Design a binder for this molecule. Sequence first.
Ligand SMILES: CCCCCCCCCCCCCC
Ligand SMILES: CCCCCCCCCCCCCC
Ligand SMILES: CCCCCCCC
Ligand SMILES: CCCCCCCC
Ligand SMILES: [K+]
Ligand SMILES: [K+]
Ligand SMILES: [K+]
Lengths: 262, 262
Amino acid sequence: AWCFGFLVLGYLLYLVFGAVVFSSVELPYEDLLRQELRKLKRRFLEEHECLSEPQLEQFLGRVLEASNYGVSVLSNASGNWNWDFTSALFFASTVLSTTGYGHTVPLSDGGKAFCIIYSVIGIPFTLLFLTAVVQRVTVHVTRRPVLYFHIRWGFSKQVVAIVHAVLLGFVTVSCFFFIPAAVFSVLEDDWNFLESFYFCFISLSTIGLGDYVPGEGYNQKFRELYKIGITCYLLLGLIAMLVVLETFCELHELKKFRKMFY
Amino acid sequence: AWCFGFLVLGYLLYLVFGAVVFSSVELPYEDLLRQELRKLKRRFLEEHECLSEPQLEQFLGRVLEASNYGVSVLSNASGNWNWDFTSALFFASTVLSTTGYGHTVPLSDGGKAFCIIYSVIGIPFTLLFLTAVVQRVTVHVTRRPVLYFHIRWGFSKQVVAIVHAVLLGFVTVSCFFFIPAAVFSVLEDDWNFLESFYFCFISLSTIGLGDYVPGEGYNQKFRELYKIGITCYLLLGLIAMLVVLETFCELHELKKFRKMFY
Ligand SMILES: CCCCCCCCCCCCCC
Ligand SMILES: CCCCCCCCCCCCCC
Ligand SMILES: CCCCCCCC
Ligand SMILES: CCCCCCCC
Ligand SMILES: [K+]
Ligand SMILES: [K+]
Ligand SMILES: [K+]
């Protein structure tokens, strides 16, 4: 009934809350870096006294645009190749999965045209693949065992459904957040558990903001195999998430909530 | 029946197709830029003959990391502020909407911890808001008029549903892709219709790869109002997309397909 307006107001106010706290958290840091660059650049020109400021600007602009794409001039402009076939496979999985990883400017002019045609057919297609798998998977993982819980012990399905949903909710977080976060943290030599879990969450959830992809390690050994394994893991984790989500919707308490709310 | 395996093989082969074409499209361009930096940096050191290469590396690394975050040293390190309250509001809407816009490294250490707690409660919440609105909206926009089409002219609902779905599919693309792409293209002075439509598609779809957000224009006048209007537009466009998607699922031909497929 009228409560629907309450949800909209609460949600929009929640968004405002998120915005203000994000600004407070990131404003002193960004200001600190801004001040740091505003002294470092000036210092560079000061001590050298041999280089000109307008002339430096063209070089800085070109390199910065290059790093916006994702190619760095560091290491004699010879870092780990960024657009090899394997990384492209990770990129395609992340576009279809809607995680959308990539750099500040991800694709060149021609590649933005192609993405549109590729994705516009491949999003309903991947969605069709995902729904079919969760459908087939959910019957085997969740509905059929609930019947086993219902037949052998002969007690209320609703009690089983809540308990089954929570236990599944725990295993998937255990198996697909805590364990992978540990794996990535030990593997990558520049991360810790919090940051690795951040990547896990932002990957299994389809946010995928920015890039922040494990694999940018210089002189990585099995970079290709790593890339293809984190792609299969990503897609499959989205399935597991899209199964625990499905079971929660089936629950009487949650499905009743949405209907009573409306 | 067995056809399910055919879908999985076709989908995975489709992903491989996307990867190879993406690599071919982006490999010569990235190589060209890589070669260009591999001559430009060397030229810079050559003509100046006053600056040292290892000493330059620290400065380049610091600035490049700063631009990975999204703060540029250009314009005397005083460009349009990036983390003001309004931009943060756009960022929060894009995290909840799962579009995930942001730079190569979007958030500092503290802000990655906060995002997890904020999003983990706010994704089921925004999802709950979205489903409620499409539910209420769909009845008014689609079901009730279909009844008008069904009562007044008294002919097959299925014919109406297909025709109604296509017409709705046309209006929303007309109203929320072609028109906004035109608006952004004329507004922003550095884009054209193709690129603007690319942003529209990647925004209404939850991909949102990289950043590529209109608003980075230097000396923008009404940047704040622009930011808040493109946030309301983004969220609302996701609603319209999540309504045309819903109506297509209702169609007998499409719902039959998924069931016959399974
Ligand atoms: C790829 C299909 C569309 C997007 C699906 C997004 C699912 C998000 C699930 C979030 C689960 C809860 C995380 C805390
Ligand atoms: C909002 C959170 C769940 C994800 C919904 C994604 C919807 C994608 C719609 C794509 C429509 C393409 C039309 C041509
Ligand atoms: C029960 C079918 C699972 C299929 C998983 C495919 C992962 C690429
Ligand atoms: C029919 C209700 C529409 C609500 C729109 C809210 C936009 C922020
Ligand atoms: K995304
Ligand atoms: K998404
Ligand atoms: K994204």
